[PDB]
Amino acid sequence: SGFRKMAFPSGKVEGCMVQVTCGTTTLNGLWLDDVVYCPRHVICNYEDLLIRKSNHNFLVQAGNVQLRVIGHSMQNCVLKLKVDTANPKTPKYKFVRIQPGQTFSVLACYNGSPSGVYQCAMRPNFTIKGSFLNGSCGSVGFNIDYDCVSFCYMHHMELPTGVHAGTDLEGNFYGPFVDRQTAQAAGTDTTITVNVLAWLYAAVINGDRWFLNRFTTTLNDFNLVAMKYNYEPLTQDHVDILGPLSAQTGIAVLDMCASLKELLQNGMNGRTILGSALLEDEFTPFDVVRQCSGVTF
């Protein structure tokens, strides 16, 4: 038993992290096969500014070994450096783009050296609530599936409120952000309803049951409450995804929605759920299944 914010084992990703230096800027790159991927602002009109640069301007260090750059190109907001050596530690991988509400692990790195791992959710306003200091640009987000690494995030900047924004590995930003020193702010965020419900199921599976009640609701009635408290809408697809947790616990989703409705309207009356005094929304339904059934990689 027990329930913790759990990240994927990071070893497959650790073997791909390198240090990239251009002039006096140093940040992290992802070495896969014979290409190194990193944020394009390492060269700081990127188009005009990339043509001036040449191959030996980019210093790539894998541990204590230098890679030689034999080509470079830009794709959206990511820089791609072709190197003369394929990474022998390249795992099975693919590039994916995730949706708001989905979770992933972040490997936070400095000077090409991994330093910590934590689990995050892509917020509805397309930020992540991470922990990043100077030099973390190029740190990466990922999920693991059977034996495949899905890379989904690369860090580019911190916003004034202290949250973080980045791109997918194809260089497209998540959210309404740009990579340059202009005034930018995180939009109003909302709570990921389907994830809160999944975490309430986790609580039940772990014996924390006090918030359960005899009542049920309708998707319509509950969504009018959700809107009222800045909760994301709950769709029929969301209901269906929670189906395995409903069957395992005996609590139908709209029965659990009645519990969540009361928690919103009335609060926690001084109690906690799974050691938290707030409603947690960074576990997906799949995260709860995986942790409570012991999936391995």
Ligand X SMILES: *[C@H](O)[C@H](CC(C)C)NC(=O)[C@H](CC(C)C)NC(=O)[C@H](CC(C)C)NC(=O)OCc1ccccc1
Instruction: Examine the residue annotation and report whether 164 is marked as an active-site residue of this protein.
Output: no
57 counts as binding a second copy under rule CB under 8 A: no
Nearer of residues 1 and 188 to a second copy, judged by Cβ: 1
Binds 275: which of ligand X, a second copy, Na ion, none (CB < 5-8 Å by kind): a second copy
Question: CA separation (Å) from 156 to 227, 276, 285?
Answer: 31, 31, 28
Which parts of 163-222 interact with Na ion (CB under 5 A)?
213, 215
Binding partner of 34, given a second copy, Na ion, ligand X, none, CB within 5-8 angstroms per partner class: none
- Segment near Na ion (CB under 5 A); pick from 89-97, 120-128, 258-266, 268-276: 258-266
Nearer to a second copy by C-beta: 158 or 221? 158
- Quick one: tokens of 193? 């309803």
Region for 56 from its dihedrals, namely left if φ exceeds 0, alpha if ψ lies in -120 to 50, beta otherwise: alpha
Task: Determine the Cα–Cα distance for residues 241 and 194; give it in Å rounded to an integer.
Answer: 9
41 annotated active-site: yes
- Minimum CB separation from ligand X for residue 182, in Å? 6
Q: Which of 41, 155, 156, 164 is catalytic?
A: 41
- 230-239 in b/e burial notation, b at 16+ Cβ within 10 A? ebbebeeebb
Cβ atoms < 10 Å from Cβ of 117? 16
The span from the CA of 205 to the CA of 84, in Å, is: 52
Note the residues at the interface with a second copy (CB under 8 A): 1-12, 14-15, 107-111, 113-120, 129-136, 158, 162-164, 206-207, 272, 275-278, 290-297
Which active-site residues does the annotation give?
Answer: 41, 137
